[PDB]
Ligand binder design. Structure first.
Ligand code: NA
Ligand code: NA
Lengths: 147, 147
């Protein structure tokens, strides 16, 4: 196995991208039409919304992924914060240090865009993983689903 | 005292908006030029990035504020999640139920836009406040500042 890190491309709909997201949470059965629609809506944000993928070359499937959306604010001298989302590594490839590579790629992008911070939410069990990526836990997440 | 809830407007730079944000965290001394630049960059996102303010009428200053940025995803059938940010109530006006009004305004906007959830981060001490707004705490926030 060999791993290539890069951004999501429109052809990744045939490389198990949506299937890998399904290891994080419900995707539904996303059609090619819908995949392309939402790919172009995200591409429209340019550098303010980046999806990283790692492809495993032999299988030609996506092995890991993570996203970041840059939020412009008024505080912090009209600063910018990165929100890292949708980080998932295929269970087959856990222990291969792919999730760190994804997170670092997105942190590198946000530092380069002049963000003052990056944040993400995780389970209590995954705190120590993200501490290894230089992060700290000082707040909690609240959520409301419109189920 | 009388309170009017609405969206941020370009004239709010003269109504203590940036001063109120300074009760949450560092703003720096944001110029009118920079305020207008960043107001128009956020306005450009339309319904995908809403800032709510509550003005206290007698003083004509902003008494509370909160923001939401809608993130488009591929999971959840190409769903949308609302990220509520930058929620702050002037210390003078705490106990007047303004923060609930702000949060509910932003949740109402996200439900109307078809989001499947809304999330935000808070201190452990403020968990119970947000539980009163119908939210639940099941994850933690990790952060990295580029200080
Ligand atoms: Na923004
Ligand atoms: Na988006």
């Amino acid at each position: 196995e060999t791993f290539k890190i890069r951004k999501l491309e429109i052809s990744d709909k045939r490389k198990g991208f949506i299937e890998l997201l399904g290891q994080l949470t419900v995707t539904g059965s996303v059609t090619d039409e819908e995949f392309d629609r939402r790919f172009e809506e995200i591409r429209s944000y340019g550098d303010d919304h980046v999806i990283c993928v790692i492809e495993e070359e032999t299988s030609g499937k996506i092995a890991a992924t993570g996203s970041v959306m840059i939020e412009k604010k008024f505080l912090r001298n009209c600063g910018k914060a990165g929100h890292i989302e949708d980080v998932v590594v295929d269970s087959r490839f856990r222990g291969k240090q792919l999730g760190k590579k994804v997170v670092e790629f997105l942190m590198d992008h946000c530092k380069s865009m002049g963000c003052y911070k990056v944040i993400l939410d995780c389970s209590v069990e995954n705190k120590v993983f993200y501490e290894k990526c230089g992060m700290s836990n000082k707040s909690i997440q609240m959520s409301k689903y419109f189920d």
